[PDB]
Design an enzyme around this catalytic site. Structure first.
Site, PDB file in Angstrom:
ATOM      1  N   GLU A 119      -9.717  12.073  12.142  1.00  0.00           N
ATOM      2  CA  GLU A 119      -8.938  10.878  12.445  1.00  0.00           C
ATOM      3  C   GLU A 119      -8.064  11.072  13.680  1.00  0.00           C
ATOM      4  O   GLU A 119      -7.058  11.792  13.649  1.00  0.00           O
ATOM      5  CB  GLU A 119      -8.094  10.483  11.234  1.00  0.00           C
ATOM      6  CG  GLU A 119      -7.373   9.151  11.435  1.00  0.00           C
ATOM      7  CD  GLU A 119      -6.764   8.603  10.147  1.00  0.00           C
ATOM      8  OE1 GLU A 119      -6.262   7.449  10.167  1.00  0.00           O
ATOM      9  OE2 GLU A 119      -6.749   9.348   9.130  1.00  0.00           O
ATOM     10  N   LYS A 178       0.838  -1.182   0.000  1.00  0.00           N
ATOM     11  CA  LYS A 178       0.000   0.000   0.000  1.00  0.00           C
ATOM     12  C   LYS A 178       0.874   1.233   0.000  1.00  0.00           C
ATOM     13  O   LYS A 178       1.888   1.287   0.703  1.00  0.00           O
ATOM     14  CB  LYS A 178      -0.929   0.014   1.212  1.00  0.00           C
ATOM     15  CG  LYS A 178      -1.867   1.185   1.248  1.00  0.00           C
ATOM     16  CD  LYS A 178      -2.761   1.164   2.493  1.00  0.00           C
ATOM     17  CE  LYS A 178      -3.716   2.343   2.439  1.00  0.00           C
ATOM     18  NZ  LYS A 178      -4.630   2.305   3.604  1.00  0.00           N
TER      19      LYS A 178
END
Ligand code: ISC
Ligand code: MG
Length: 373
Positions: A180, A130
């Site tokens: 977040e 990723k």
């Protein structure tokens, strides 16, 4: 409105402003997960000095860059002032009409789509799983921007997020509505709520619930998400005395987006503070990738800019080890008549170049909405 030389943090944990500046702290946060690091040693020295000089209950506030080998943008203020998040939500408009002299996407669509394709190609190989890629919008106006008016609009448009306003050493301000949580520490317990996977909100309750359900059943987004949470679980397991992590993510919302979210709830020992644990985690595969070093190499090879504070963390730590750090996203840097917006997206083999261009586009709309653009 808020002066640009004041720190502001709005959160369900602690909400406060600051005044003044006792001491700036620009030591790189690299290796800050170690109590023996120069970062932690100097942090401790600086708190002891603040108290020696009559600062009661000193706090360290500010931002740490994406790459923590770079200097930090932290400081101890002279004083801090709690306020009620609930009262601020109820209270929080315009003062100026701004003209746009220049507006530039960095990079532009075709280039970003080719970057995404390259990263996706790399994630198909064994060497990386990723990579998070990002882009900017630069805007020049014809008049100095009122950062205080912008902050109030940001809160009103994003009443629930971790809303921050950070004065910077160059005279600019870092402002954002982050959804977040990277690390909260309150006594021995700590939590983290990584976000990864994204779907657009819809104005109709039926279509909106369907978007959320689609996100939860999306193999690409669930894969993008589980690469984050597996990496974090492994690290945290060895520095927690207990750790609870649900097997599956849950849906959360911002005004623009559904996200997948997994809460981490743990207990830490006396060696830890909010910054040791925040530096242990930061950046997760939500903001760099997995593996971390390989991902940051690909980022360095492909992004035509340095992230600086974008994709870092912002928040605070006190001398008792309590604190809160949130990811620096849905955010902008402004100085006088210039503004830089930032957004990123996690790339995996199932990423579409156009899809990630659009995902980062929706993310940028949080701050575009604040400016009225
Ligand atoms: C880097 C960003 O998002 C990260 C955190 C939330 C969702 C993400 C995603 O779904 O791709 C990214 O991991 C950003 O908002 O600019
Ligand atoms: Mg994504």
């Amino acid at each position: 409105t808020l002066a640009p030389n004041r720190f502001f943090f709005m959160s369900p944990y602690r909400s406060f402003t600051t005044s003044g500046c006792f001491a700036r702290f620009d030591e790189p946060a690299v290796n800050g997960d170690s109590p023996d690091s120069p970062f932690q040693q100097k942090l401790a020295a600086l708190f002891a000095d603040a108290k020696a000089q009559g600062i009661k209950n000193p706090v360290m506030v500010g931002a740490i860059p994406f790459d923590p080998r770079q200097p930090s943008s932290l400081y101890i203020p002279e004083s801090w002032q709690s306020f009620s998040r609930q009262e601020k939500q109820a209270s929080a408009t315009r003062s100026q009409s701004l003209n746009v002299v220049e507006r530039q996407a960095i990079p532009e669509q075709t280039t970003f789509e080719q970057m995404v394709a390259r990263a996706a190609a790399l994630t198909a190989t064994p060497q990386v799983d990723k990579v998070v890629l990002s882009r900017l919008i630069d805007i020049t106006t014809d008049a100095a921007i009122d950062s205080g008016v912008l902050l109030e609009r940001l809160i009103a448009q994003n009443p629930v997020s971790y809303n921050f306003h950070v004065p910077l050493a160059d005279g600019g301000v870092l402002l954002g509505a982050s959804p977040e949580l990277l690390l909260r520490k309150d006594g021995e317990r700590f939590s983290s709520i990584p976000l990864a996977g994204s779907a657009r909100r819809q104005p109709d309750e039926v279509l909106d619930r369907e978007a959320g359900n689609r996100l939860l059943a999306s193999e690409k987004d669930r894969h993008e998400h589980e690469l984050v949470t597996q990496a974090m679980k492994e690290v945290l397991r060895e520095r927690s005395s207990e750790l609870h992590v649900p097997s599956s993510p849950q849906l959360i919302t911002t005004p623009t987006l559904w996200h997948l979210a997994t809460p981490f709830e743990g207990k830490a020992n006396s060696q830890e503070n909010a910054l040791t644990l925040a530096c242990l985690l930061h950046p997760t595969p939500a903001l760099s990738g997995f593996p971390h070093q390989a991902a940051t190499q690909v980022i360095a090879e492909l992004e035509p800019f340095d992230r600086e504070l974008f994709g870092g963390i912002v928040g605070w730590c006190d001398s008792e080890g309590n604190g809160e750090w949130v990811v620096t996203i849905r955010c902008a840097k402004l100085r006088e008549n210039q503004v830089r917006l930032f957004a990123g997206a996690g790339i995996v083999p199932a990423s579409s170049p156009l899809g990630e261009w659009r995902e980062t586009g929706v993310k940028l709309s949080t701050m575009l909405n604040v400016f009225g653009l």
